[PDB]
Design a protein around this nucleic acid. Structure first.
Ligand SMILES: Nc1ncnc2c1ncn2[C@H]1C[C@H](O)[C@@H](COP(=O)(O)OP(=O)(O)OP(=O)(O)O)O1
Ligand SMILES: [Mg+2]
Ligand SMILES: [Mg+2]
Lengths: 538, 393
DNA sequence: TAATTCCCCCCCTTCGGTGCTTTGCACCGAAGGGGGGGA
């Protein structure tokens, strides 16, 4: 039936009238199902027949309902959505099974015909009119309007979520020792009661829901483990993901690569060691989503490793608030990191990866800090607290990094774990000039019109070298001059430049960059033994 | 007093809510249930398209929680100084924010004061509330209680027309020239007077000068380090020539070579030291323009800051030394420095400054709420490039 | 063809803003596209 809950008042934007879009020609097999569904809904009173007093119209269509022989009826409300007032969404995330706790009794429930059990605002019903075209040809068409929440409207989900919360609140008030997770119309109920006393509480909840016009059919009422919930399989002592199937083909297109990357990203939440960078690099520069992409050798190796990782049964465990949260981080190379969150050794609560590249130039310390921050934020949403970190970096390295850095940075309570490869800085700049070494006053200028430039130097001993350049900007000749100084010198060298841009790049101690000149300079800096950089105004 | 109306052409706040920890969620739920029970806030639905963030802070030495709302976007869209508070021995700040929770808010305007409380692990969709009374944090809220405010502390004001009181947001700054044991007694009398009817030292503030290095022997590198400082300082102080110190920097020489100073260069150096020991002339406060505050990290728990309205025209320069989280926590020290600078700026001029924080965005948004202990929130932006050699200050 | 809405995540691409002086080069940050998952 229809809930006696109050309706949410809605309105149109000022100056907008309403849609008048005509209906596109529908197929016969869809038309018959639409007619049957509409007849049933009109019998139950969810839609109302409309006449020649309503000038609005909006096309309708239908799709298939998951693993069922039923149909889902939808309306293309794009114009009405354009002219409809703005809402504020109340759903802020998705519950995770790793955030659950161990309960002695569990039940999963689903509400049948969720949207069609919530009334729609009376003054807004005239804008929801639609027409069901005749089979082939016969009558002009039967015109209806909606009395309940339609599927396809921009305001329906928030209204339904608020109404469901309002309905559920009184029951949760009187039973504070029963855990209820609600997502849209899906309900997960957990308790520490005996099974016999758990069934009675479930029946009382079902009666309370029915009193408000919401039905819970026995088809989607789960009573025995394992339980299917939000794409996961829940067992009494462990949880896992529902089976993930990877496409197995010999010719790959851009769309197939996109879907495979998405599936691997989804699977990387419980399977440890998933890497997608080599597969993801193939998406750069391609345009059409049907173009055959020849797989490289660095991507085939990644695919072969990920395929072997997913051949083993992997499960998680539930949260225990009486213990500690431990997150351990490992480095995989090429700016990729993995992490595991657990409470007891060799029993993971969850796993994850981090491979974002932020900035033109960076080192290993900054990426580790970014990964720590991301893990901290994720652990606050799921568990509400920050874990203890196990980082592969020496305490002396972090101490000497954060004290000399010009920004402010911090890492929460952590301890060092000796698992190679470790995080370290590859070179350091002298704080004082080196006595008994060449000075290498360098310079470089360019012309902005011809886009031509030069970069040279001179030393105290008397050596000079000038190298003309081409197709370079003004702030590239300075880097070229610094590279020239680093090349034609010994192991210990002073350098005096005229540019703050190059000095600011170099002083951050990068080890990777998107520029080949900076990458050359990084290797030349690692090669040397003692380097000092000084700036002088022009 | 019927606040009415936003700024012409503006719409309203539409800011999302950041996640919180379990203790903060529990405290917020406990506070909001009691607040709703007394008619201060009311539950709303999704048809209200406005939102502002909220969180909670534990005040020092109180062992209780306070709820804070980020009413920063509402303030800029809303339509419609004692120059003796800086010269005062002891100044105290008192919380008078609890007074606003008796004056109701206009029916037309309360839709803009909407906020959402999240849940741990997203077990339930968020719960929304809107204010029925004047909220704590909005700029137009004290400007309504002000007419009623001009009459509460009058039986304490005309008695002793020496104490200077000034109100910003929810805070009352009260200052006198009494002893630390008698100023406290007068503040206690004011507390009693407030109860029945329903420690800063500004004189210890000084600027931070620019000091030129003093040495007996000067190398080529040392001279190069000095000319680079004088060239930058010539922007703030017009009249510095620095044309003889660069004459002995001609030619290619080893950085560790000792250059004897010419007497002409010595005279120039002494005169430029003399023109650096005086305050800058030609800088005034424009009440219409905004204030900008820059912070630089110096290491070993030392920070420097500059407050100015126009580039190279500094209104104040200062240095902050650490006291909590000693060389262990950096976000804590930066947060404390920001709070201190904001407090100093409210006592003078009157407008809170806009901060150029020397931090990354994500770490700040992650960790700044764990140490904040004020009731106002200044607007800020983050810098990314290295500022300079940073030895100017 | 084939058609809808809301939420979370990842990865790639464009354009606007800033600001250093270089007046347009270099760097960064949002919004949009594709894909995964949920109802
Ligand atoms: N593809 C979709 N488009 C629009 N709304 C959708 C879609 N899928 C789900 N919803 C919304 C509307 C549904 O009423 C609500 C709950 O989904 P679901 O339980 O699968 O369907 P239902 O409750 O209408 O039918 P059933 O009787 O099979 O449970 O979520
Ligand atoms: Mg379902
Ligand atoms: Mg359902």
């Amino acid at each position: 039936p229809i809930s006696p809950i109050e309706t949410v008042p809605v309105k149109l934007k000022p100056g907008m009238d309403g849609p008048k879009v005509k209906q596109w020609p529908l197929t016969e097999e869809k038309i018959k199902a639409l007619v049957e569904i509409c007849t049933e809904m009109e019998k139950e009173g969810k839609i109302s027949k409309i006449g020649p007093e309503n000038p609005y119209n909006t096309p309708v269509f239908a799709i298939k309902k998951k693993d069922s022989t039923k149909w889902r009826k939808l309306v293309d409300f794009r114009e009405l959505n354009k002219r409809t007032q703005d809402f504020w969404e109340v759903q802020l995330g998705i519950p995770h099974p790793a955030g659950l706790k161990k309960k002695k009794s569990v039940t999963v429930l689903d509400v049948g015909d969720a949207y069609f059990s919530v009334p729609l605002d009376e003054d807004f019903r005239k804008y929801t009119a639609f027409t069901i075209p005749s089979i082939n040809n016969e009558t002009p068409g039967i015109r209806y309007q909606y009395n309940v929440l339609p599927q396809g409207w921009k305001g329906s989900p928030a209204i339904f979520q608020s109404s469901m919360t309002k309905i559920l609140e009184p029951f949760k008030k009187q039973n504070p020792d029963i855990v209820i997770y609600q997502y849209m119309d899906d309900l997960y109920v957990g308790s520490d009661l005996e099974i016999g006393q758990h069934r009675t509480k479930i029946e009382e909840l079902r009666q309370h829901l029915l009193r408000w016009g919401l039905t819970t059919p026995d088809k989607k009422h789960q009573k025995e483990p394992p339980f299917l919930w939000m794409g996961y399989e829940l067992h009494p002592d462990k949880w896992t993901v529902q089976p993930i199937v990877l496409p197995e083909k010999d010719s790959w297109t851009v769309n197939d690569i996109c879907k495979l990357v998405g599936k691997l990203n989804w699977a990387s939440q419980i399977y440890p060691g998933i890497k997608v960078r080599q597969l993801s690099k193939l998406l750069r520069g391609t345009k059409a989503l049907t173009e055959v992409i020849p797989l490289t050798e660095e991507a085939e190796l990644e695919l072969a490793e990920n395929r072997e990782i997913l051949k083993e049964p992997v499960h998680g465990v539930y949260y225990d608030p009486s213990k500690d949260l431990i997150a351990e981080i490992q480095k995989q190379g090429q700016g990729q990191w993995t992490y595991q969150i657990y409470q007891e050794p060799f029993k993971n609560l969850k796993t994850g990866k981090y491979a974002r590249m932020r900035g033109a130039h960076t080192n290993d310390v900054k990426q580790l800090t970014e990964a720590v921050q991301k893990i901290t934020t994720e652990s606050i949403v799921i568990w509400g607290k920050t874990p203890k970190f196990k980082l592969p970096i020496q305490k002396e390295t972090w101490e000497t990094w954060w004290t000399e850095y010009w920004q402010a940075t911090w890492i929460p309570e952590w301890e060092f774990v000796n698992t190679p490869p470790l995080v370290k800085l590859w070179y350091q700049l002298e704080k004082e000039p080196i006595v008994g070494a060449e000075t290498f006053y360098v310079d470089g200028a360019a012309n902005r019109e011809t886009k031509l430039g030069k970069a040279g130097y001179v030393t105290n001993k008397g050596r000079q070298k000038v190298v003309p350049l081409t197709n370079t900007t003004n702030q590239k000749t300075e880097l070229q001059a610094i590279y020239l100084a680093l090349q034609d010198s010994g192991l210990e060298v002073n350098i005096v430049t005229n540019s703050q841009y190059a000095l600011g790049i170099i002083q951050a101690q990068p080890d990777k960059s998107e520029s080949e000149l900076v990458n050359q300079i990084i290797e030349q800096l690692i090669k040397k033994e003692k380097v000092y950089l000084a700036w002088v105004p022009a | 007093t019927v606040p009415v109306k936003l700024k012409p052409g503006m719409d309203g706040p539409k800011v999302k809510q950041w996640p919180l920890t379990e203790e903060k969620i529990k405290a917020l739920v406990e506070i909001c249930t009691e607040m709703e029970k007394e008619g201060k806030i009311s539950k709303i639905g999704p048809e209200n398209p406005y939102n502002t963030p909220v969180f909670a802070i534990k005040k020092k030495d109180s062992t209780k929680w306070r709820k804070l709302v980020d009413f920063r976007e509402l303030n800029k869209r809303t339509q419609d100084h004692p120059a003796g508070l800086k010269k005062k021995k002891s100044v105290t700040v008192l919380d008078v924010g609890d007074a606003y929770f008796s004056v109701p808010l206009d029916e037309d305007f309360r839709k803009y004061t909407a906020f959402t409380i999240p849940s741990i692990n997203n077990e339930t969709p968020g719960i929304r509330y809107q204010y029925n009374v004047l909220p704590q944090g909005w700029k137009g809220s004290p400007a309504i209680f002000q007419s009623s405010m001009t009459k509460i502390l009058e039986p304490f004001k005309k008695q002793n027309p020496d104490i200077v009181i000034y109100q910003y947001m929810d805070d009352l700054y009260v200052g006198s020239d009494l002893e630390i044991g008698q100023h406290r007694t007068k503040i206690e009398e004011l507390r009693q007077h407030l109860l029945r009817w329903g420690e800063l030292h500004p004189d210890k503030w000084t600027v931070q000068p620019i000091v030129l290095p003093e040495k007996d022997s000067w190398t080529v590198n040392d001279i190069q380090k000095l000319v680079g400082k004088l060239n930058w300082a010539s922007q703030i102080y017009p009249g510095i020539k620095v044309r003889q110190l660069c004459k002995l920097l001609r030619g290619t020489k080893a950085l560790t070579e000792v250059i004897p100073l010419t007497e002409e260069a010595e005279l120039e150096l002494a005169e430029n030291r003399e023109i650096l020991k005086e305050p800058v002339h030609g800088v005034y406060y424009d009440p219409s323009k905004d204030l900008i505050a820059e912070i630089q990290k110096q290491g070993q728990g030392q920070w420097t800051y500059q407050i100015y309205q126009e580039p190279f025209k500094n209104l104040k320069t200062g240095k902050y030394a650490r006291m909590r989280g000693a060389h262990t926590n950096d976000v804590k020290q930066l947060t404390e420095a920001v709070q201190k600078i904001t407090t100093e700026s409210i006592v003078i001029w009157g407008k809170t400054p806009k901060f150029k924080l020397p931090i990354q965005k994500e770490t700040w948004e992650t960790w700044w709420t764990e140490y904040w202990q004020a009731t106002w929130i200044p607007e800020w932006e983050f810098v990314n490039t290295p500022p300079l050699v940073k030895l100017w200050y």
